[PDB]
Amino acid sequence: RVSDEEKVRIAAKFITHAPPGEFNEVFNDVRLLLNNDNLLREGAAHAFAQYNMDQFTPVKIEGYDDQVLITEHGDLGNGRFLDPRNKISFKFDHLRKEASDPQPEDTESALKQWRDACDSALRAYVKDHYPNGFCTVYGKSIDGQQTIIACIESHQFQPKNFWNGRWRSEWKFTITPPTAQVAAVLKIQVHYYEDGNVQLVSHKDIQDSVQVSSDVQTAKEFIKIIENAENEYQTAISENYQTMSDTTFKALRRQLPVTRTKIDWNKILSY
Amino acid sequence: YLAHPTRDRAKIQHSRRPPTR
Amino acid sequence: SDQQLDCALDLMRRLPPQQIEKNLSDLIDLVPSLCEDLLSSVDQPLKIARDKVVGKDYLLCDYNRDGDSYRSPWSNKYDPPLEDGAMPSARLRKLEVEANNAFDQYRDLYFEGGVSSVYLWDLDHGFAGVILIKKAGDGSKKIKGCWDSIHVVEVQEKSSGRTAHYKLTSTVMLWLQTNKTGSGTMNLGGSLTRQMEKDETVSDSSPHIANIGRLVEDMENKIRSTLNEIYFGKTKDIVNGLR
């Protein structure tokens, strides 16, 4: 038999695999399939947090103009997260997707100025390039290595028209004077589900380099690399859709037989 | 909230015989 | 609708179809009680098998399964062999033969390749069947492509029978995948399912196989166009709306 341990593994797997904007529907399907409310909110608490960190969930805090992203990089513990731009911690309710309890948080450090410079350039980059995108930029001393991590999210949820979509990108610049190494992953997921279930899942990896100069110049060079790469990626996706529509899809099946008319089923059945 | 037409399409009407497992 | 099977089917509508097979497997693991009903209600990509006797390919799905064996439409035998596998009546087998032939021609005319299979089963006051079509690439081209057609028809004959009721539920699964330096990995996959029913005349000039063929052809032509709109129109527009 399937042990409860494999079961919880499954409920948690299903929840972490919910498409964008559909966490609640998936959670409630899994709730009803296990019929054990306290086991679920026990054995699956990790999955709720995992989902929101994987998805870069944006959240509005009462008191602050700027939304912030839930990511692994801002995990403060105890269901609390860092807002490095507004310089607060807040409580995040992973089930309700609700921010509460903002409290001032100390973000001062030697790297704050490089983080601030990258955050300023990035924020302008994001507002210009995404209809309602949000970004969060973190500064971490990781291997004694100073690292800037820029996370970008943009989603569009239209459940009433049976579709939801989300773009996430994650950009790591390890600030090792004189040549900083750049690593990114761009991801897209789109789900359409009127009378079916069609998804696009896409990702692209980026490797690059930039010369470390001043904070404001290094930031500008960082943003250029981001813009060029996110532009090429979007461009190429659309080129791929055209090619798929023009070639592969057309080859899988004809619109009609060579006669250019539907089948005469009498003639089929007669030989 | 979604319709599930594959639940109401014809089903096998002798008793199947499950796969392993 | 709050019912467990409706929840399970709802999950299948939301979970990534890129993992369609493991999703079903995990679901049956979570709710074994529903194993038979999910096996019957959850479409899975078709798998191709080889009939040694006739040297013809055939397709595997839940509908031609008994235990861990599948029945060929060409030879009418199970693989691996079974001692009392479920068999259509001698009568219904003959129609299944006519239907397989008819749908092998339909496949050639629309698909110019691939593989077809038709499997019929008796019902109390008629019969039912599935018409399956699989057309893939071999995986060597830049853009990988696979089409699964799963057409499930229910025929309820009247007291003559010079008229019958047909209910058709059709699923097409379409899978496209490419790895290009410009776009990174791109996997656009999934399925659409539509249902219709019609009363038709059954006569020698319009037999069951003719009526079913017309319904399958009409429905498949419509789903093809909808797939084109959703895959290459709607999802692309959503992508472009994100940035």
Author numbering:
A (entry chain A): 7 to 277
B (entry chain C): 149 to 169
C (entry chain B): 2 to 244
Paper passage:
The actin capping protein (CP) specifically binds to the barbed end of actin filaments with a high affinity and prevents the addition and loss of the monomers at this dynamic end. CP is a heterodimeric protein composed of α- and β-subunits and the molecule displays a pseudo two-fold symmetry due to the resemblance of the tertiary structures between the two subunits. CP caps the filament with its two independent actin binding sites at the C-terminus of each subunit (“tentacles”). V-1 and CARMIL proteins directly bind to CP and inhibit the filament capping activity of CP.
Since the CP-binding motif of the CARMIL proteins is sufficient for the interaction with CP, peptides derived from this motif were used for the crystallographic studies; mouse CARMIL (residues 985–1005; referred to as CA21), human CD2AP (485–507; CD23), and human CKIP-1 (148–70; CK23) (we collectively refer to these synthetic peptides derived from CARMIL proteins as CARMIL peptides). The consensus motif interacts with CP across the two domains: the N-terminus with the CP-L domain and the C-terminus with the CP-S domain. The binding between CP and the CARMIL peptides is primarily mediated by electrostatic interactions, which are supported by hydrophobic interactions. In addition to their extensive interactions through the CP-binding motif, CD23 and CK23 further associate with the CP “N-stalk” via the C-terminal flanking residues of the motif. In the CP/CK23 complex, the C-terminal residue of the peptide, CK Arg169, forms an electrostatic interaction with CP (β) Asp30. Thus, CK23 appears to have CP binding affinity comparable to CD23. CD23 and CK23 moderately inhibited barbed end capping by CP, while CA21 was a poor inhibitor. Surprisingly, CD23 and CK23, which possess substantial affinity for CP, strongly inhibited the CP/V-1 interaction, indicating that the peptides restrict the conformation of CP to the “low affinity to V-1” form. Therefore, unlike V-1, the CARMIL peptides do not inhibit the barbed end capping activity of CP by steric hindrance.
